Symmetry: C2
Subunit: 98 residues, 2 copies
DNA sequence: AAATTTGTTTGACTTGAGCAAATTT
DNA sequence: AAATTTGCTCAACCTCAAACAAATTT
């Protein structure tokens, strides 16, 4: 009764294909494209912080969304995210989400 | 300005850039919608695994396999990088 | 008023540096 | 042959549950 929904398909984005048809695609692929386009625009000094860059760019909207969904409740938010309420406070502090 | 962006197309077939964080927001909006008060449980590791895999995959390909360079480029310890590659079975 | 959440403090699961072996240059 | 990288140890330097009093939401 239950069709398999793979991990790549839990977080998806609307795309437009060659037959001009709207179709979901893994968020994975967005991250891939963002990086592909970042590397090409890299002519060509050293990089020292790619992880923190990507991480911030991803944590910020996760926190934003989780907080909208729990309507400010940091306890609920922390529970659903699977992290300790203290690290959630720290992260919200980091991105000025207060 | 925004260094991490993706391409989009509108109805007039113009391609334009969009910060990746907008994609992430969209995906989450969708995720929350599709489930109806079913409890969400490990959202952080979920998103993290969805972002670390294509990150590792893309810097490994860029450094042609050089873990040392990949690690320097990412700003993480080489041991950490080893751990993550083991974790998503890219080793 | 009772229950829950906040805000805060305590104290208990990434990194540089080695070094030998393998690999690339 | 030399230089660099991998693979693997070390031990020392963020996330966590817990507690609890004060604010707040129910």
């Amino acid at each position: 009764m239950f069709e398999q929904r793979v991990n790549s398909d839990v977080l998806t984005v609307s795309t437009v294909n060659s037959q001009d048809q709207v179709t979901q695609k893994p968020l994975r692929d967005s991250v891939k494209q963002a990086l592909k386009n970042y590397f090409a625009q890299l002519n060509g000094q050293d990089v020292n912080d790619l992880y923190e860059l990507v991480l911030a760019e991803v944590e910020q909207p996760l926190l934003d969304m989780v907080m909208q969904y729990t309507r400010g409740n940091q306890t609920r938010a922390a529970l659903m995210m699977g992290i300790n309420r203290g690290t959630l406070r720290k992260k919200l502090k980091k991105y000025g989400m207060n």
